[PDB]
Amino acid sequence: MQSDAGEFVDLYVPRKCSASNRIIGAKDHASIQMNVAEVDKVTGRFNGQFKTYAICGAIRRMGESDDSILRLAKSDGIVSNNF
Amino acid sequence: SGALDVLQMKEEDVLKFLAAGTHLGGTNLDFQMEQYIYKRKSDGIYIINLKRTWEKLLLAARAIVAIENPADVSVISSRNTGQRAVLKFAAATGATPIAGRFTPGTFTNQIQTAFREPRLLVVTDPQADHQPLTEASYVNLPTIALCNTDSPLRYVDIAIPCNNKGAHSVGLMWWMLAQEVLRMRGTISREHPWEVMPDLYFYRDPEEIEKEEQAAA
Amino acid sequence: GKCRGLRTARKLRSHRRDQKWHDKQYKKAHLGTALKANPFGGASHAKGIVLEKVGVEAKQPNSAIRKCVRV
Amino acid sequence: VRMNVLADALKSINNAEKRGKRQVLIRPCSKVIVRFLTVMMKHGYIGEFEIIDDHRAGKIVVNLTGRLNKCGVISPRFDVQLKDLEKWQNNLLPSRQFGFIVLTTSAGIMDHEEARRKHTGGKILGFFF
Amino acid sequence: TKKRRNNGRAKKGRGHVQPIRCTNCARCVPKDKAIKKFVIRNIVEAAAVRDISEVSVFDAYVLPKLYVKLHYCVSCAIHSKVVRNRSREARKDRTPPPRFR
Amino acid sequence: KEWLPVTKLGRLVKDMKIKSLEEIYLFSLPIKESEIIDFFLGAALKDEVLKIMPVQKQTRAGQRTRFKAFVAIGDYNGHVGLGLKCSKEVATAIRGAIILAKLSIVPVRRGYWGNKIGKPHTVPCKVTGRCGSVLVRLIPAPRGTGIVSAPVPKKLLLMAGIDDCYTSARGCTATLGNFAKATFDAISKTYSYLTPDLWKETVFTKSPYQEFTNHLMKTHT
Amino acid sequence: GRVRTKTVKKAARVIIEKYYTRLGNDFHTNKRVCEEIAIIPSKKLRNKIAGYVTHLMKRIQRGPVRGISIKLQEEERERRDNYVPEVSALDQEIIEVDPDTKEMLKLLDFGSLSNLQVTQPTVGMNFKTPRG
RNA sequence: GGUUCGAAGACGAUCAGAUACCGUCGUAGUUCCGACCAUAAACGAUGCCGACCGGCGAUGCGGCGGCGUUAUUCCCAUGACCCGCCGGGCAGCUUCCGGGAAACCAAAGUCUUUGGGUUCCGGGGGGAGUAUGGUUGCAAAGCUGAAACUUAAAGGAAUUGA
Ligand SMILES: [Mg+2]
Ligand SMILES: [Zn+2]
């Protein structure tokens, strides 16, 4: 987003929905920022690190927030691939 | 949820689900809840897949553990069935319970007495608790729901496919979320089975209360 | 337009030409009838002889006599 | 009847992209559609696609990335001379930074910026931004 | 402005339905436009039954009924209060009124 | 004049832990306090009343006139807000309209016409905004063109800090309730438009409630 | 014609909400505690509020009175008829487990339990309601 | 050919009047056969062909798979129910698909991010579907169809009143 010289000029960079790959508008109030906790392999206990996801307003009220969160988690290997 | 033998579904937990009757969905089926259903019976009731119940329940447990301050998780049930279970969950974890009649504008109205401002919503039945979901449209607020086969997944981000109708089923599903949150946190051990009996969560209707008030007397 | 074919030019041209008569101001300027009916005959001004004076009464709310002249 | 096949194919992609679908099956596969989609891929608006042979007109399954605002067609195929490619790319495309007019020339099917460089005018197919 | 979806009538995919004479007037209304009503009535009203239950020659002769199907035009139906005007919302309710007793 | 915060992020702002409107706009937080906008963009925010409009409702004993004031606010460096408000006095109609205009300000995105030298002066691409019948379109123009538009979009785009813009309006624009709402929706869409610059995959920062969680547990109930 | 107004009901509900610790089932005891805790300028309104307090709190004891919910305190008050069950209502023996559910468990590894009795299936698919 | 009904008619009422509504009769007509007529709120007030874009439960015709009930007792095999699937068709309910001035619409969507093909047709309200010519018809009348003049509004959906 930079000029001829190479100076990043726009006053901020908006987030993009993990499911749809739309940019989450400055006032898309039905957009979520959901942290799914990362668990230690040997104990099964919380580490203090998380696998964060963003989703757009249209996707949520479409009713595809459930399957999209699921598929992102199953891609990361949080949910078992077998499922 | 998976790739781990520690978070794996135990032979103890299966008998608890079958005894409560959480594997049994409704007669009618939603189009976005097909992936959580094994098969339809002769009698025409849908059998919910208990692995896919467990995978989503652990995903929900993870999402609740990642929230740091435990008192900006609002737990909700408007009907009779959940009112005990959410208060038990609330006291046991530190989550803030809204039991019976969610007044419209607790997240939207600044001037209200009960102007709450949570970071995660856990809901018993989207059809009954439709107002907290429709209101969590106005605030950037992820939603968890005890969704039945009949449930619409509009404004629901992780739907745990269960029976949310039966009084035993609601009680246990709240109990296993309450326990997995505490285990993952590192408060209870996976070595020992949990102190609390799941009947501490169940809804005793006045009829059962009066019959037992004569029984024990 | 509607008919978009690459050899659809006489259709478009002829159609617009037919439909421009249904325009009021076009047909007014392009028929002879208006410039026959115009007293001045398509002129800026016109000279005439005064033959009587007239008091033309106004319409509703405006009540007055507008002092015109027959020419 | 089905007069234009590229018109159907681009409306199918456009409808699927708006609805937020992750891949779309555009049916009556043709040399012009494939050569259109290769150009669209080389700039990186679509993903990798897989063309499915039944012993007929084939099918195409296009893996969609959510970075495609519009993919349209111009019918009829107007004969764009090189100097007039300015007034075309002026009134079709959003800005002078991004977006492409793909037009079928002597050399082959290629975007306005390539055709301007190669010094060739030709018949317009469509646009994608 | 469009008031009904089904233009006050239960014709969808015909073109023509033969008309009927109203039972109050003799006004020609189409067969499906008309407000139809089926009155199944005892011949003897309410108290007459008791007097004819005693002054009958026979033993538990279940005295007959009177079956009359009535077609009303919309004006005759509204005037006789067989139907009434309704709210914009309530207009769409097609479930007939409960007849519990 | 003591502003005690009612909202959770009204607390984090007054405690000087969030130090930009970009922290808010990035995480799409609803701004319910009128004082957060007066905190950050307090200096350069300038009001202009677009119109006062008397709207009536019929009763059996006379009409009941109440006044509706349209207010466009914004620093001339990439924020506009348009607020409307009805009241029995024109004074409290303006006062409420100003407050609502502050509540609902958006960041505008600015780009270049062709060559990418200096600071961004025009709209990054062709954007259209609709309200009722009115359709306002904003097109990028070369440098030092000025704003080729009607007075109403001109003054909104002036306050937005866009210098160069060709415009084209259709519908019943005589209604300047819908005109300016159409312009504001057109302006507001510039940051919710995916150009090939916003292609680089996003890296996720902590939301300010997760960031300053431990502070908000002790600071207030 | 004895319908109590908003001022009676609201203020009585607020006093039950806060001071549930002292209020009782006797009228004259809670009349005195109400006079002590609350500044009510007239004596008639004092008796009206105290009268409502010792009618709501005579029904809190019964069951799920709506307009108030002191959750910890009302639930600890529901923890006065203590039914702590000794055997879990779930922890049972032989379970009737649907020949369809047999496979559902068998597609998980645990298709082999002691207390999974498979009841014969309901022949005749007549689970629907007539459209008459 | 003329049973019923019934424009014009004839009277009887009603009313200030009633050439009307109400009543009693009643001619052309209402019916059939053979020749004309070519218009209707001839309506979904919504051209036809093709593609894509949500959900749900019924319904009519055809096909396919499936526990079981029932009729042919002798049941193979046919019908009647029962539970799903596929393709056309008349519709329905639902929704922030999306559109629209709104009412409302899975099309009236896929439209300033504007182009799949093609026929007909509208350009403020009146004058006016009027005059005039031409044409079809036995006639009634149909199709084509202006101008001078006049006027700042007529109008569409929705809101609050009365
Ligand atoms: Mg007809
Ligand atoms: Zn009638």
Numbering used by the authors:
A (entry chain W): 1 to 83
B (entry chain B): 2 to 218
C (entry chain Y): 2 to 72
D (entry chain X): 2 to 130
E (entry chain b): 2 to 102
F (entry chain D): 58 to 278
G (entry chain S): 2 to 133
Paper excerpt:
The 5'-UTR of the (+)-ssRNA of the Dicistovirus CrPV harbors an IRES that is able to direct initiation towards ORF1 in the early phase of infection. Interestingly and in contrast with the HCV-IRES, the conformation observed for eIF3 in the complex with 5'-UTR-IRES is very similar to that observed for eIF3 in the 48S complex, with the IRES ‘filling up’ cavities that are present between the 40S and eIF3 in this canonical complex.
Two main classes of particles containing density for 5'-UTR-IRES, 40S and eIF3 were found in the dataset. Both classes contain density for the 40S, the IRES and the core subunits of eIF3 (a/c/e/k/l/f/m), and class-2 also presents density for eIF3 subunit d (eIF3d). Class-2 exhibits a 40S head in a swiveled configuration. In class-2 (closed conformation), the head of the 40S exhibits a medium-range degree of swiveling when compared to the widest displacement reported. In the swiveled conformation, the latch is open, and the channel formed by ribosomal proteins uS7 and uS11 is plugged by eIF3d, which in this class presents robust density. In the swiveled configuration (class-2), the 40S head brings eIF3d close to eIF3a, one of the core subunits of eIF3. The 5'-UTR-IRES exploits the characteristic swiveling movement of the 40S head to bind and progress towards a conformation that ‘locks’ the IRES onto the 40S, and at the same time, induces a compact conformation of eIF3 that has subunit eIF3d in close contact with the core subunits of eIF3. A swivel movement of the 40S head closes the channel between the head and the platform of the 40S, effectively ‘locking’ the 5'-UTR-IRES into the 40S and inducing a compact conformation of eIF3 with the eIF3d subunit in interacting distance with eIF3's core subunit a (left top).
